[PDB]
Design an enzyme around this catalytic site. Structure first.
Site, short mmCIF file in Angstrom:
data_model
loop_
_atom_site.label_atom_id
_atom_site.label_comp_id
_atom_site.label_asym_id
_atom_site.label_seq_id
_atom_site.Cartn_x
_atom_site.Cartn_y
_atom_site.Cartn_z
N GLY A 10 92.23 44.08 146.37
CA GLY A 10 91.00 43.99 147.13
C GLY A 10 89.72 44.12 146.28
N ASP A 44 87.38 44.24 127.68
CA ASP A 44 88.81 44.40 127.48
C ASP A 44 89.05 45.28 126.26
OD1 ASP A 44 91.65 43.39 128.17
OD2 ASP A 44 91.51 43.15 125.97
N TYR A 49 93.80 49.42 119.60
CA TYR A 49 92.72 48.80 118.81
C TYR A 49 91.95 49.84 117.99
CZ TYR A 49 93.54 44.89 122.06
OH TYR A 49 94.10 43.90 122.85
N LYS A 78 94.81 49.44 128.10
CA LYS A 78 96.22 49.11 128.03
C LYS A 78 97.01 50.30 127.48
CE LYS A 78 94.76 44.42 126.76
NZ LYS A 78 93.67 44.72 125.80
N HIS A 111 100.80 47.16 127.91
CA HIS A 111 100.35 46.22 126.84
C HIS A 111 101.43 45.21 126.46
CE1 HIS A 111 97.35 46.15 123.27
NE2 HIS A 111 97.82 44.92 123.48
N1 NAP Z 1 97.11 41.76 125.56
C1 NAP Z 1 97.31 41.48 124.28
O1 NAP Z 1 98.40 41.66 123.73
C2 NAP Z 1 96.18 40.86 123.50
C3 NAP Z 1 96.42 40.15 122.33
C4 NAP Z 1 95.37 39.50 121.64
C5 NAP Z 1 94.10 39.60 122.18
N2 NAP Z 1 93.87 40.33 123.32
C6 NAP Z 1 92.49 40.48 123.85
O2 NAP Z 1 91.82 39.20 123.86
C7 NAP Z 1 90.61 39.26 123.09
C8 NAP Z 1 90.31 37.86 122.49
O3 NAP Z 1 91.34 37.45 121.59
P1 NAP Z 1 91.22 37.53 120.01
O4 NAP Z 1 90.35 38.69 119.57
O5 NAP Z 1 92.60 37.42 119.48
O6 NAP Z 1 90.46 36.19 119.53
P2 NAP Z 1 89.44 35.11 120.08
O7 NAP Z 1 88.56 35.68 121.13
O8 NAP Z 1 90.26 33.85 120.35
O9 NAP Z 1 88.66 34.77 118.74
C9 NAP Z 1 87.85 35.81 118.13
C10 NAP Z 1 87.29 35.22 116.82
O10 NAP Z 1 86.44 34.11 117.14
C11 NAP Z 1 85.18 34.32 116.52
N3 NAP Z 1 84.17 33.78 117.45
C12 NAP Z 1 83.79 34.32 118.64
N4 NAP Z 1 82.88 33.56 119.26
C13 NAP Z 1 82.67 32.51 118.44
C14 NAP Z 1 81.79 31.33 118.49
N5 NAP Z 1 80.98 31.14 119.53
N6 NAP Z 1 81.85 30.49 117.46
C15 NAP Z 1 82.69 30.68 116.42
N7 NAP Z 1 83.53 31.72 116.26
C16 NAP Z 1 83.51 32.64 117.26
C17 NAP Z 1 85.04 35.81 116.31
O11 NAP Z 1 84.14 36.05 115.23
P3 NAP Z 1 83.10 37.26 115.23
O12 NAP Z 1 83.70 38.40 116.02
O13 NAP Z 1 82.93 37.51 113.75
O14 NAP Z 1 81.84 36.75 115.86
C18 NAP Z 1 86.48 36.19 115.98
O15 NAP Z 1 86.78 35.93 114.59
C19 NAP Z 1 90.93 40.36 122.07
O16 NAP Z 1 89.81 40.81 121.31
C20 NAP Z 1 91.60 41.38 122.98
O17 NAP Z 1 90.57 42.04 123.73
C21 NAP Z 1 94.89 40.92 123.99
#
Ligand code: NAP
Length: 316
Positions: A10, A44, A49, A78, A111
């Site tokens: 909800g 998130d 982390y 998580k 997680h």
């Molecule tokens: N549940 C799980 O097991 C799990 C696993 C993986 C991720 N997650 C969550 O999902 C979130 C996102 O995934 P992720 O951190 O793997 O990677 P992502 O969001 O796919 O990519 C992050 C990367 O992209 C860069 N970036 C961000 N915006 C940009 C733009 N406009 N232009 C160019 N580059 C850009 C960032 O650089 P800068 O930061 O240097 O700007 C960083 O190096 C995580 O941070 C986490 O909160 C969860």
């Protein structure tokens, strides 16, 4: 495009949030402050982390500054794999709450479906290198999550990295009290997840897409790996819409009724990534992006491929 999606508890969840995996502790407080200033209402987080205290300093300051009200924020964290035991879940949740400076979470996720031996190490190893499992199973950990709802510590519970058999196991749990509200899974044009998304959505479970930009800062990146942000086919869609490649990659899951959580610590990119409510990808564009699937994973949990509950042997 509405900004929030209704969950099966909800409550409404913002469809765009800020990711914090790999955000350095000395940069993430400013990142979250900038994000809330420029409109983000969903963060998130996760204990693993190692930066929740710093995320919490930003949240508290913006609540103190009356930039936003607590009811307008949607904070997710998580439960890490070394806390799947019944008697450790509450304390794990309360450590996260204390770090984030909160008295409740909007959403708390398991997680990974794999439990590990409790202790100080997040990935406990045997002398040969394999993850030491826990014998606690996913259903007993889910009952412990349900207790957190009934104690007022969390408003919603969900799962992450569960395959469809594992989601089904939860849904078929004897005595199930609360269905998962969310399954948070990797999803992007190279891992489009059609089957698992269809399944979850049909059950009223909202899907959150993680690594939507392909996680170019993931620690294990290899030069030879595919690169979404540099794919000329995606750059061409972005050019047609006068948007950045990242903006197309964020809008794509939004138009599949997913939540999406791009990570940045760069203020200009935090603001850019939020500017995705003002254009539409055509159906042709969506189908074209879906066609780039290659079943490529950022996060494959490779030290746990023999765990009984490893999620990615299963076709989905
Ligand atoms: N549940 C799980 O097991 C799990 C696993 C993986 C991720 N997650 C969550 O999902 C979130 C996102 O995934 P992720 O951190 O793997 O990677 P992502 O969001 O796919 O990519 C992050 C990367 O992209 C860069 N970036 C961000 N915006 C940009 C733009 N406009 N232009 C160019 N580059 C850009 C960032 O650089 P800068 O930061 O240097 O700007 C960083 O190096 C995580 O941070 C986490 O909160 C969860």
């Amino acid at each position: 495009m509405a900004s929030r999606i209704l969950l099966n508890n909800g409550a409404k969840m913002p469809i765009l949030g800020l990711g914090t995996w790999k955000s350095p502790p000395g940069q993430v407080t400013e990142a979250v402050k900038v994000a809330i200033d420029v409109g983000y209402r969903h963060i998130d987080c996760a204990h693993v982390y190692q930066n929740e205290n710093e995320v919490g300093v930003a949240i508290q300051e913006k609540l103190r500054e009356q930039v936003v009200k607590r009811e307008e924020l949607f904070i997710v964290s998580k439960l890490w794999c070394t806390y799947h035991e019944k008697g450790l879940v509450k304390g794990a949740c309360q450590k996260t709450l204390s770090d984030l400076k909160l008295d409740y979470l909007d959403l708390y996720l398991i997680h990974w479906p794999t439990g590990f031996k409790p202790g100080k190490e997040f990935f406990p190893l045997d002398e040969s290198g394999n993850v030491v499992p826990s014998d606690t199973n996913i259903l007993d950990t889910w009952a412990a999550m349900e207790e957190l709802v009934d104690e007022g510590l969390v408003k919603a519970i969900g799962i992450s990295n569960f395959n469809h058999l594992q989601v089904e196991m939860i849904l078929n749990k004897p005595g199930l009290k609360y269905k998962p509200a969310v399954n948070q899974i990797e999803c992007h044009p190279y891992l489009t997840q059609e089957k698992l998304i269809q399944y979850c959505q049909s059950k009223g479970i909202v899907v959150t897409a993680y690594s939507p930009l392909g996680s170019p800062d993931r620690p294990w990146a290899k030069p030879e790996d595919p690169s979404l942000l540099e794919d000329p086919r995606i750059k061409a869609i972005a050019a047609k819409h006068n948007k950045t490649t990242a903006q197309v990659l964020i809008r794509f899951p939004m138009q599949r009724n997913l939540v999406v959580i791009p990570k940045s610590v760069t203020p200009e990119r935090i603001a850019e990534n939020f500017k995705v409510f003002d254009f539409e990808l055509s159906s042709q564009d969506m189908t074209t992006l879906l066609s780039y699937n290659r079943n490529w994973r950022v996060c494959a949990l490779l030290s746990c491929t023999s765990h009984k509950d490893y999620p990615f042997h299963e076709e989905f």
